Amino acid sequence: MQIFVKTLTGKTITLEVEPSDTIENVKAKIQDKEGIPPDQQRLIFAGKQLEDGRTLSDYNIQKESTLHLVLRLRG
Amino acid sequence: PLGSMTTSKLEKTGLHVHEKIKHMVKNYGTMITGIPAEILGQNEAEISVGYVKKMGNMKENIAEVVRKSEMTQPTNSAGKASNEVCDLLLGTEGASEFEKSSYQVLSGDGSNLKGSLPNKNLLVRVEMDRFNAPQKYQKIKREEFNPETAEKNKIYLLEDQLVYLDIFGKVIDLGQTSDTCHRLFNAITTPFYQNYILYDEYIDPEESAEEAAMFEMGEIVKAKMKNIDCWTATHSFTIFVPESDSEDTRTLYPYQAYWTSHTLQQWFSGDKDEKLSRLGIDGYIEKLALLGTTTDSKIRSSIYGELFSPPGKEHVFCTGMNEKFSPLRVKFKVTEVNPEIALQNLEEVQEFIDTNYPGENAKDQCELYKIKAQEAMTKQLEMRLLIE
Amino acid sequence: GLPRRIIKETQRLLAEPVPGIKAEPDESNARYFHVVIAGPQDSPFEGGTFKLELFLPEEYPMAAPKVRFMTKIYHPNVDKLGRICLDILKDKWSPALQIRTVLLSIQALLSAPNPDDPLANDVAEQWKTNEAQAIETARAWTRLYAMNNI
């Protein structure tokens, strides 16, 4: 399924994923497209912080869902 | 009056490029990325609308959230900071081509990087990996084992096989005969040890058959995992290596941000780029190379802190919870920087800043930028929150 | 009943306590620790004694201990439930870390509070924009809640 990842700057990238992929796998796919290490990322879905070990299905993420990529965090 | 009577060196040095990007980052922060302030404000309202109070005076509730937002403060993603450096120094087209080239693993003494620095203006991009090996195991029966839904990056001990389920869910055999695994399987019987860690220093093999098996399994996995690709990217930065006249006079300047620690702006404000430049080309590369060959956590933490801590925190950056226990891998790639286009790129960003956010000093131009972002965020939130 | 690591960690915490930290296991639950951290010198919490509870989850030591402040404290890294914003950066928890390591980091956080998101944490906004007044507030709370409380 295709999902979207949006940044504070409005930049949107499209990912091809499976509901069984972990958040860790999604961050690796963001690295492949933007060159940003997974440890330098935070992903948010509908106000919820996404944790590394859980799956997209765990957060009910589906086709054409939009995740928010946070690139500034203090704490 | 001296303006028309004097000329200046028309040749652009790499040092001019370094000082201008440093000056602009120090003074303008995110504005050097070229994104309109109203764009940041509109997108910030999207992620922060859930923080606004729902009752009372909504204009006041919105202003509290608008005042507390940090939307115009710079990224502290090390990867995002490297992207912006590439975009300014190479142009967006050049950075897109640079992003496709290959990373090269730094050799044990750093020689391959040393041998990849010809005497022209160069940009080096670095991606550091950490070894994300498994730390836990579980005894499981083959009937009840399903790699599609089992926890990943974990060791699974079956009665006739020992496997590693990697980060993508692929099953990898760990070379153990069914005789060995049947022994290890039936020796581990204690309830809290059916699902435990692999490298518990308090397990004494002489104490029992169960601890002897757990210890044997730990020795097996550590040896097998040395041959498996568990590298995951952790840090990113760039190094500007300007052209010099003499090999003895060559210096480098690392640029970086760091997750939850500091921005490129603060890196420059603390002059850590100049501090590290004092190590010289080979001295810096040697510390970088030792980061990947040492197996002592204290040495790894000391070098990591020296190279990557914010200015002043070198001795406390990798202590306690931040001690560097994972092995590290340094990867690099190199490309040339044309000072003429890079300086031109920076001058065009300066024009955008001066045309759209004018002011008498940099502090007032940044304040105007933030105000415009705040005004756009206010309007977005005022519409969104009519929906009770 | 318990893995040897938990037993030996407990023994060493009792016989070799961390300076300025008292950590004792619960008599009825050996996975539960009652902790007191003294406010560091030259911090706004100087002179205070802060109670915390620490729990070793089933998955310990592959999972981190769970810790909460039980004493009220005005600090940009502690929320209203007493949870603490620490966490090793650019890496995860590993069994190479132990209880003593967590307790040391909380004490270090009291000396060197890190920034936090001003949103959903008004203490972080005060520490960023009015540090002298935020420190003044932390001192008052230390006198009110963290003195003569043990």
Residue numbers in the entry:
A (entry chain E): 1 to 75
B (entry chain A): -3 to 384
C (entry chain C): 3 to 152
Quote the study's own text.
Here, we demonstrate that MavC actually targets the Ube2N–Ub conjugate to catalyze an intramolecular transglutamination reaction. MavC-catalyzed transglutamination proceeds via an obligate thioester-linked intermediate to form an isopeptide bond between Gln40Ub and Lys92Ube2N. Architecturally, MavC1–384 is composed of three distinct lobes: a core globular domain (CG) flanked by an insertion domain (residues 128–225) on one end and an α-helical extension (HE: residues 33–66, 356–384) on its opposite end. Ubiquitination of Lys92Ube2N, located adjacent to the E2 active site, effectively inhibits Ube2N activity and attenuates downstream host NF-κB activation.
The product complex was generated using Ub–Ube2N product isolated from a MavC-catalyzed reaction mixture where free Ube2N and Ub were linked via a γ-glutamyl-ε-Lys isopeptide link. In the product complex, the 310-helix is highly extended, with Lys92Ube2N positioned in the MavC active site covalently linked to Gln40Ub via an isopeptide bond. Notably, the methyl group of Met317MavC occupies the position vacated by Ile90Ube2N as the 310-helix unfolds. In the product complex, the aliphatic portion of the Lys92 side chain is held in place by van der Waals interactions with Tyr254MavC (inset) positioning the ε-amino group within 4.2 Å from Cβ of Ala74. The proximity of the backbone carbonyl of Thr230MavC to Lys92 also indicates a potential hydrogen bond that may stabilize the Lys amino group in a productive orientation. Though the side chain of Lys92Ube2N is well-defined in the product complex, the region of Ube2N surrounding this residue still appears to be dynamic. This is inferred from weaker electron density and the relatively high average B-factor of ~70 Å2 for the residues from 86 to 95, compared to ~40 Å2 for the whole complex. A further pendulum-like rotation of the insertion domain maximizes interaction of the E2 with MavC by pulling the E2 closer toward the active site, as captured in the P65 substrate complex and in the product complex. Unfolding of this helix brings the Lys residue into an attacking position in the active site, as captured in the product-bound complex.
